[PDB]
A paper describes a structure:
DNA gyrase, a bacterial type II topoisomerase, is a clinically validated antibacterial target. Unlike most bacterial species that have both DNA gyrase and topoisomerase IV (topoIV), M. tuberculosis has only the DNA gyrase enzyme, but with a simultaneous functional role of topoIV. It performs the essential function of introducing negative supercoils into the DNA as well as decatenation activity.
Here, we present the first 2.8 Å resolution crystal structure of compound 5 in complex with the M. tuberculosis DNA gyrase core fusion and a DNA fragment. The compound 5 was present in the crystal structure as a racemic mixture, since the two enantiomers were not separated prior to the crystallization experiment, and each stereoisomer was modeled with a 50% occupancy. This pocket is predominantly hydrophobic and consists of the amino acids Ala74, Ala78, Met81, and Met127, engaged primarily in van der Waals interactions with the RHS moiety. The crystal structure reveals another feature of RHS binding, namely, the halogen bonding interaction between the bromine and the backbone carbonyl oxygens of both GyrA Ala74 residues, which provides a symmetric binding site. Both stereoisomers form bifurcated halogen bonds, with one forming fully symmetrical halogen bonds and the other forming less symmetrical halogen bonds. The secondary linker of 5 forms a salt bridge with the carboxylate of Asp89.
Numbering used by the authors:
A (entry chain A), B (entry chain B): 425 to 430, 437 to 673, 1014 to 1500
Write the structure that this text describes.
DNA sequence: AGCCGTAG
DNA sequence: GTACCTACGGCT
DNA sequence: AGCCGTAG
DNA sequence: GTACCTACGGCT
């Protein structure tokens, strides 16, 4: 018998029962889900404690930081047991602690973080079987005239769909299945009937078989040893798809949930695809904008519309992250070749953030259209979106080599990518060589491409010092590239010397840079500086003026700035990309080859598509010419026919043509019987037959395929290619 | 010479100049605009202080609230002069204080609030001519291949457009001209070139002619006397559109800006239109959803998409307010007849808020479709949206009497509306009478309608005590309607008496209600209560159980609850609506009549539209029959014709038909020459001619018009009408 | 501990 | 992932 | 000093 | 209108 809420957490919706043995606590992902849960629960014995998203990983955090965490405090207070040596099982307020997170890999992650907290801070709760996982449904199958059905697995969804269709139930396979990605999507009634009703619900009870084994696993998964974690996930993620209260071992739960999360982050969030150089968020935003018709030929659209359309139809995630991605693809200091044309305040290279998406407007850039060129000609694979309503492309055609041109930065689980941007003309040269020397071996190709791709070309210009770092990156996929800002020495009328900083290394925050100098001068770490002034403007660009003391040597001050500030920084190149669904550290030659392979695939697919469409068209045109030759009998037959169907059958017989051709004749407008229009049909047939011949020739001759790739890339480079900004010095 | 920051406001971007005479401070609406301004300014002399939206009205505000206001503190600190008796002009940091707010009525409002602050707290700044208003452009004309042009007036926009077109410049008919609603829409360069460059900018200098007159005006506009303000706006809003440094008198500026804001809020934000009962936000959301195809026949769409589409194409305001409006129209406890069908967490009648719009899904209700019925048949007026890209309806057809059915609540400037919801069947009865007794005078109509509309019918059910309040509201437009919750007396197994509260008055927050009782028991204001328990569930609804002491009398406790809690509350009826663009307090008879008038208008317009379309169709069909009669000559002519154009001209001559008919013949598919298809054209002509006759008869006979209105409303009531929830007791 | 870039 | 601040009016 | 609903 | 909290990794 323990007191209930009428100094416990404010956000906690407690139960009426004082008996811990009858009382249940649902720890719920966010306040949205918390609301549904609170409204749907039996308040007699079900308590609801909503959290603020990703709770602190207590494995990595100092105990002081963990105890200061508001979410951790709330959990400890709610449970009432205390922690570690002060842990008292007798004071437990709820004998069933139910973790209820969203039916997504992030939810799984939050579960893993919570289980880590309970294991490290309150182990006896797991030992004594007080910790449960709720199993909310993944899918709601909406039938016409029949009650909706709930599926808790992809397999179950497919099974129930097939069973319902066999039973004569009508769904709508497009919008028929709703995929719950967040508990906030379920109403209180649905949540109760599926997840919270003791009569219906399924709870997975967390068990602890081997404390020592569990201890080791938690260290690997949640600890600071990145290498151990990376190795754990590589060896096990291979075969994890094979590994009412249902018992589940904590070790197995942690392994499954964490590996699911890790692989999701790696293969489908944080890292670029080698062929188009796009993270999934980027691809979805650009395709959504394309499908919405936000093309360079039309007027800028409110950023909000693009974000909303993307979010609603694809990327089933937060609006902030989608908007941020969109903003970054619009920033000319972030991307060497922006993919979004922004109108309004898209932020500063300093600490000024972008305006709200309600104020900003955006559309695709001409270059972005080259990423999406002929996407409607089966040039790439399409898959069903998260819920299966619409189709989305797996990769973009990417007629421009975006991965190397724009680079990619990303933090995955147990790994990161950091690919620098490059000059389009240099990359094109490399591609042209690879096309011409298709049969060159790896060594020859590497040598050739390294000779043409001189190094990173950052949007912020500046200097690259030395070639070693670049060479290492190109040969191994890893390298330290030294970047330097540009300093000009100016002497004033009275005889004083000033350093003018005009260019900063890539990803250096202008404001933080200035503040850092000021701090260093204050601290006495930078000497010989009398005055520092920001004279930067829209009209003149970056102009930071550092006045040197009369006794100070300019060169000495410059060297100290290189040593003690981001005026000189190193770009840690890690050329990691997804290749055939696998993360790979790649050499420069490999990256070029994978791009070339993709472009060849695109041309073959485009040509195959066009050939099929040409044949379909030619088929119709042949039918029309037959009709035109027997025009009088055709018209007479149609007029004599009682029904369209009789006419159709009569035409098939009269002209020895198929259903498709007969229909096309029936669909011919009277305007087409004009002399010129008749001639046009004849001419169109001749032209299409010529096209068919050409398309067949392209398919037959790989040299023509390579030629097409070369010519079309050359066109893009002619129109969109630009001068190198970054200067390379010895 | 004053110090510049390298204890001043964090968000302030100060200037380099220490000379107040050369230094300028731009006080900017929000951080978005602040960013653009900061990036575009000349940092030598131009300081930027961004604010957090609507700064506190110091005229109304308690000194405690004023002193706590972070924005007010920031301004005082920035200027450095102090306030009132401690005001020191010599310490002024910037001799030019430039107010830069968004080119919208809200921006005008913020200006008025800032001018109120300066007048009350720092008057000498206005006296000495230190206060200026920035004048940004209204329009950006986007040319292809040519630099954009900026217009500061509608006349200037039109002039520049015509000049550019004469000069051979190409614009874009589909969003060539952008209407700036927010400074965040302008990039740094645009803002500088238009608004901040001393060489180009226009500043309006605020002057103070008569301190006493100004003092009185500020009291009227910004003070607590609502009646004085209401009277000021009614008399003056009539003729306010008639009343490089340009001087502007503070009195004139305040009057113009405040009246503009007030009228915008009154006529186009806070109050319903009498004909459809919709505030503009409601109309725009429902129409946006309609135009997007989010109909009851299709699958729920993510709330975000609806909000974004609404925001982007119409309602040029914050996403939070749009979403909140959408959520409220989905809440069955908020609306007697919900217009939005929500899926997911749309909040609770208590303190649980709705889930984020990224989780919730929404579509129109069947009843909402009755609001929008035949909107595509010129049944209502359309006007250009805020920027003129798209057309939007002024009012909805509203085939259901939404204003009275759903009610309306809103706070305008110097006024408010509070119309209670009513029973659809009762309202329909009233409408039917008004239709039948079209010529009845006001007195007769009032008597008749009051007899049929028994009183408010709240979504929360409960009780209405007495008829007086209802009668007053119906006769005057103002009334106090007493609402009461429902209490059941239950006796438990041990012999104790409990009060079970099952229904609460309209707009009573369930959680606050419970908390209020607990507080009153604690305070000793409620005696005889032993225990209070919330036994409410999704399955059983509202069930608050109050256990009474053995010595306590149930009836006494109930009466005390009615006295000291919202168990009994009064609905303050204020039946205020926009009639022909004017806010009007209306009687019940007037409200019914205005609705009936609207429905008659709709039927006449629909019939007129259908007649026109019928005639157009008949015209084509007549042409086709002529062609069918001379089929051989028609086909022969077309075949003999070199071009379609020659054929068209030949047909006009051969058949004595017009261009439209000739084209229709040319567009006829060969399938239509089948016997049945030919007959169908003949039959279609006969049918359409019958339709034309009927439509003409409807236009001729107002009795048929009233009949149509009656019948169609009756159909809606049959399908969507429901039982009275609210019980009326003596 | 604090910087980046998609996530809660 | 979450939580306050304000203008407006009319009751408490 | 605080409730409500479209606005910053 | 605005401002923090966190996971993830790899440099500082
Ligand atoms: C901003 O600031 C801030 C501060 C603090 C806080 N806290 C809590 C919460 C919050 C929030 O609210 C913020 C914001 C709001 C809004 C959101 N969203 C927006 C949007 C969305 C979507 F979906 C769309 Br389509 C749009 F358009 C918009 C964000 C966040 C805060 N805050």
């Amino acid at each position: 018998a323990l007191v209930r809420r009428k100094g416990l957490p404010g956000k906690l919706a407690d139960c009426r029962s004082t008996d811990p043995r009858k009382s249940e606590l649902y720890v719920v992902e966010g306040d949205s889900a918390g609301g549904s849960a609170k409204s749907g629960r039996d308040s007699m014995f079900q308590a609801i404690l909503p959290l603020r998203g990703k709770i602190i990983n207590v494995e990595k955090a100092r105990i002081d930081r963990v105890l200061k965490n508001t979410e951790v405090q709330a959990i400890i207070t709610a449970l009432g047991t205390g922690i570690h040596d002060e842990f008292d099982i007798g004071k437990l307020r709820y004998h069933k602690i139910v973790l209820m997170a969203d039916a997504d890999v992030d939810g799984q992650h939050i579960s893993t973080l919570l289980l880590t907290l309970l294991f490290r801070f309150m182990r006896p709760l797991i030992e004594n079987g007080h910790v449960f996982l709720a199993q909310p449904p993944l899918y709601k199958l909406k039938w016409q005239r029949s009650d909706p059905e709930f599926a808790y697995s992809d397999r179950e969804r497919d099974g129930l769909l097939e069973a319902g269709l066999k039973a004569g139930k009508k769904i709508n396979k497009e919008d028929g299945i709703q995929r719950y990605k967040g508990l906030g999507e379920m109403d209180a009634k649905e949540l109760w009937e599926t997840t919270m009703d003791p009569s219906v619900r399924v709870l997975r009870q967390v068990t602890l078989d081997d404390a020592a084994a569990a201890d080791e696993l938690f260290s690997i998964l949640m600890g600071e040893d990145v290498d151990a974690r990376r190795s754990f996930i590589t060896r096990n993620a291979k075969d994890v798809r094979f590994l009412r209260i249902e018992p589940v071992d904590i070790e197995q739960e942690m392994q499954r949930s964490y590996i699911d999360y890790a692989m999701s982050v790696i293969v489908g969030r944080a890292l670029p695809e080698v062929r188009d150089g796009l993270k999934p968020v980027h691809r979805r935003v650009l395709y959504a904008m394309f499908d919405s018709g936000f093309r360079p030929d039309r007027s800028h659209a409110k950023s909000a519309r693009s974000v909303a359309e993307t979010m609603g139809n694809y990327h089933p995630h937060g609006d902030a992250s989608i908007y941020d991605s969109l903003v970054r693809m619009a920033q000319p200091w972030s991307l060497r070749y922006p993919l979004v044309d922004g109108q309004g305040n898209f932020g500063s290279p300093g600490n000024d953030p972008p305006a709200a998406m309600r104020y900003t407007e955006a559309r695709l850039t001409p270059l972005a259209m080259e990423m999406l060129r002929e996407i409607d000609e089966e040039t790439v694979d399409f898959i069903p979106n998260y819920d299966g309503r619409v189709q989305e492309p797996t990769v973009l055609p990417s007629r421009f080599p975006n991965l190397l041109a724009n680079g990619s930065g990303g933090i995955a689980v147990g790994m990161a990518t950091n690919i620098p941007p490059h000059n389009l003309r240099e990359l094109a040269d490399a591609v042209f060589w690879a096309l011409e020397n298709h049969d060159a071996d790896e060594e020859e190709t590497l040598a050739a491409v390294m000779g043409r791709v001189k190094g990173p070309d950052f949007p912020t210009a500046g200097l690259i010092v030395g070639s070693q770092g670049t060479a290492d990156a190109y040969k191994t996929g890893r390298g330290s590239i030294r970047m330097r800002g540009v300093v000009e020495v100016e002497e004033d009328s009275r005889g004083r010397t000033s350093l003018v900083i005009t260019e900063l290394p890539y990803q250096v925050n202008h404001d933080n840079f200035i503040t850092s100098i000021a701090e260093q001068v204050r601290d006495g770490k930078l000497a010989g500086i009398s005055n520092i002034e920001d004279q930067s403007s829209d009209r003149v660009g970056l102009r930071i003026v550092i006045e040197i003391k009369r006794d100070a040597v300019a060169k000495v001050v410059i060297n100290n700035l290189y040593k003690h500030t981001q005026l000189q920084t190193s770009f840690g190149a890690n050329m990691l990309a997804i290749v055939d669904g696998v993360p790979r550290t790649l050499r420069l030659d490999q990256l070029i080859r994978y791009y070339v392979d993709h472009q060849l695939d695109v041309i073959v697919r485009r040509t195959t598509y066009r050939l099929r469409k040409a044949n379909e068209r030619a088929h119709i045109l042949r039918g029309l010419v037959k009709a035109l030759d027997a025009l009088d009998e055709v018209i007479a037959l149609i007029r004599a026919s009682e029904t369209v169907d009789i006419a159709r059958a009569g035409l098939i017989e009269l002209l020895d043509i198929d259903e498709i051709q007969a229909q096309a004749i029936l669909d011919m407008q009277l305007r087409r019987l004009a002399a010129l229009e008749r001639q046009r049909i004849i001419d169109d047939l001749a032209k299409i037959e010529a096209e068919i011949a050409d398309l067949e020739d392209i398919l037959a001759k790989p040299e023509r395929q390579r030629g097409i790739v070369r010519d079309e890339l050359a066109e893009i480079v002619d129109r969109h290619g630009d001068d190198r900004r970054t200067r390379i010095i010895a």
